């Protein structure tokens, strides 16, 4: 949403001074917790999925990526092991591949 | 900062916990949670601007996207940054925001 | 904690992708997300205490402001931390919390002095 985004920036005209918006822009950047909305919109636009349904996937990816990093998994057949037997094979292998390529760099981010 | 009465009322929920270890975990996780330090920013925005809590989010989500695009493209120009704003946008507001982001594109 | 059935069902939406690049891009940004780590924290809080999302959110915001306040003001004594709680506050919880934060105050200060 970039059209109704500028319709939100206009609310800055309800401010009291140029000092409050000066401290409001500084707090809008460093607070990276607001980056989730950009992640949701880019997920809904790339997968043609609902906002509520995009939240379920992102939590799943977060949960699994954190998991393979926590246990420090370098084994391919170990990654494949936690996938259920009735899981889409090509997607299972695609994920497994991505897990292996980033399991090193991800663990450093802790 | 300080602790409000609502905060102490919220803390008492820990008496519902099954063990003292859960209480210990929740404390550690709450301190380390960077995302939690935004409920105050959400409240400040919603109070000093007299908007909805939802409307407060929409502004912060939009402001974050804007201040991110300033560093993502490293716009050093004071005019090309105002090009992002549409023609039907408040003149004095699009002149103020581009005057701050241009001064905060370095440490970004 | 392992993945649930609902979790694997959610993963299958990745098949709706237009390229393998957006899938790996999704994996990277889902991992390095503080917001996603918080919603996981909310879920177990709601689970353990048998509370709602709102009630759990309040507690975590409460615990966040208090634990940070302890580290910021450097309250390295039980008497100083006990001074924060009102008189009508539950005594046993008052003692448990002031014990927990008297242990981590030193490790919390250092953690904040970094970032």
Author numbering:
A (entry chain E): 3 to 112
B (entry chain B): 1 to 108
C (entry chain A): 1 to 115
Publication excerpt:
The COMMD (Copper Metabolism Murr1 (Mouse U2af1-rs1 region 1) Domain) proteins are highly conserved in metazoans and unicellular protozoa. There are ten family members that play key roles in intracellular trafficking and in the regulation of transcription. A hallmark of the COMMD family members is a highly conserved C-terminal sequence of ~70–80 amino acids called the COMM domain, which has no known structure. The N-terminal domain of these proteins, which we refer to as the HN (helical N-terminal) domain, is more variable in sequence across the ten proteins, and is proposed to ascribe unique functions to the different family members.
